Amino acid sequence: VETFAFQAEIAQLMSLIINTFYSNKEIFLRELISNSSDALDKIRYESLTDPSKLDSGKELHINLIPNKQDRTLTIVDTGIGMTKADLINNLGTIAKSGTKAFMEALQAGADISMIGQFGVGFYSAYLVAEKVTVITKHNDDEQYAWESSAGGSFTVRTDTGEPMGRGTKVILHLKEDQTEYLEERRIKEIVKKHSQFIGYPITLFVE
Numbered sequence: 001v002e003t004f005a006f007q008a009e010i011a012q013l014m015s016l017i018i019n020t021f022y023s024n025k026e027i028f029l030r031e032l033i034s035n036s037s038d039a040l041d042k043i044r045y046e047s048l049t050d051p052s053k054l055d056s057g058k059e060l061h062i063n064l065i066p067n068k069q070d071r072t073l074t075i076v077d078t079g080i081g082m083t084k085a086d087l088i089n090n091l092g093t094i095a096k097s098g099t100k101a102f103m104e105a106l107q108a109g110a111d112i113s114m115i116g117q118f119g120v121g122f123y124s125a126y127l128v129a130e131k132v133t134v135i136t137k138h139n140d141d142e143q144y145a146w147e148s149s150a151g152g153s154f155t156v157r158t159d160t161g162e163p164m165g166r167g168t169k170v171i172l173h174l175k176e177d178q179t180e181y182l183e184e185r186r187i188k189e190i191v192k193k194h195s196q197f198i199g200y201p202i203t204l205f206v207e
């Protein structure tokens with residue numbers, strides 16, 4: 001287990017997402033599904049010139065998996081996945097400028113639902129989750145677990161759970177008062193409202 005500090009601006013963004021009063025929390029799901037969709041476009045595009053990129057799995061889909069016992073909602077994709085370098089350095093580096101612009105825009109009166117335009121919609125997970133665990137496997141790298149409860153740090157470790165082939169699982173450990181996002185009817189409503197044109201099958205698992 002390696003522990004890392006977020007760059008100061010990302011820590012500030014995370015605290016703002018956790019601390020600001022903002023009732024329209026449901027927008028987290030569209031942000032995460034959109035990230036999965038982008039990741040599936042990416043591996044789809046790369047495989048046009050190198051079909052061996054799909055040896056790790058041909059099926060391109062998104063699964064939404066609620067689990068009331070664990071209080072988790074998991075967004076699964078078989079997209080491109082993320083390398084260790086992504087997880088520790090590169091996404092954070094790209095995210096710094098997006099963070100600064102988002103924070104600026106939040107005066108001029110943008111609101112939190114606009115986070116996705118700044119490339120940091122991932123952090124919207126913290127509207128609803130007290131901890132987020134990301135299991136991910138990229139073709140060029142090993143399977144990793146990233147995790148953070150915010151507070152300025154995150155961890156990364158090689159994952160020894162079940163091998164996933166290729167892609168990403170974002171496990172949202174939900175806040176005690178956010179268990180509505182485990183209900184089948186609430187998830188269907190949100191997907192229908194915000195994500196009904198995604199070009200990959202989205203399967204809502206039931207309990």
Ligand SMILES: CCCCn1c(Cc2cc(OC)c(OC)c(OC)c2)nc2c(N)ncnc21
Nearest residue numbers: 035036039079081091092095120122134146168
């Ligand atoms: C361009 C942003 C892409 C990074 N990313 C994201 C969003 C993301 C964004 C992050 O920082 C902006 C980040 O660092 C903490 C991260 O770590 C797990 C994930 N989701 C996926 C996904 N499902 N599959 C592939 N790449 C993804």
